[PDB]
From Swiss-Prot, chain B:
Residues exposed to the Cytoplasmic side: 2-48
Domain comment quoted from the record: The voltage sensor domain (VSD, segments S1-S4) conducts both gating and ion permeation. The segment S4 is probably the voltage-sensor and is characterized by a series of positively charged amino acids at every third position. Unlike other voltage-gated ion channels it lacks the pore domain. The C-terminal coiled coil region mediates homodimerization and cooperative channel gating. It is essential for normal subcellular localization.
Coiled-coil zones: 3-43
Family: Belongs to the voltage-gated proton channel (VPC) (TC 1.A.51) family.
Subunit structure: Homodimer; each protomer forms its own proton conduction pathway.
Its job: Voltage-gated proton-selective channel that conducts outward proton currents in response to intracellular acidification. Lacks a canonical ion-channel pore domain and mediates proton permeability via its voltage sensor domain. Provides for proton efflux that compensates for electron charge generated by NADPH oxidase activity either in the extracellular or phagosomal compartments, thus enabling the production of high levels of bactericidal reactive oxygen species during the respiratory burst.
Tissue specificity field: Enriched in immune tissues, such as bone marrow, macrophages and spleen.
Species annotation: Mus musculus
This protein's encoding gene: Hvcn1
UniProt protein name: Voltage-gated hydrogen channel 1
Length: 47, 48
């Protein structure tokens, strides 16, 4: 049963890193949406 | 002992896997929001 310890530790390190990469991806998409929203507003198309 | 250490590792694992599934869902929703915004720009002559 103990062999699970290393397996879980290593998976959790991989997942903790993947969260940081998806956080950045998500933030980069947010900034693009803001940019697009502003563009639409400047051109009278965001209400 | 090791049993309790394992249970905790599994709980951390599920917390992390859930946050990944959330961020993958969020990223997909954001790409769809960007598609929709780009299409509105295209229709109003702002994308060539």
């Amino acid at each position: 049963s103990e062999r699970q310890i290393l397996r879980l530790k290593q998976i959790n390190i991989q997942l903790a890193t993947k969260i940081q990469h998806l956080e950045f991806s998500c933030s980069e998409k947010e900034q693009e949406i803001e940019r697009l929203n502003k563009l639409l507003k400047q051109n009278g198309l965001l209400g």
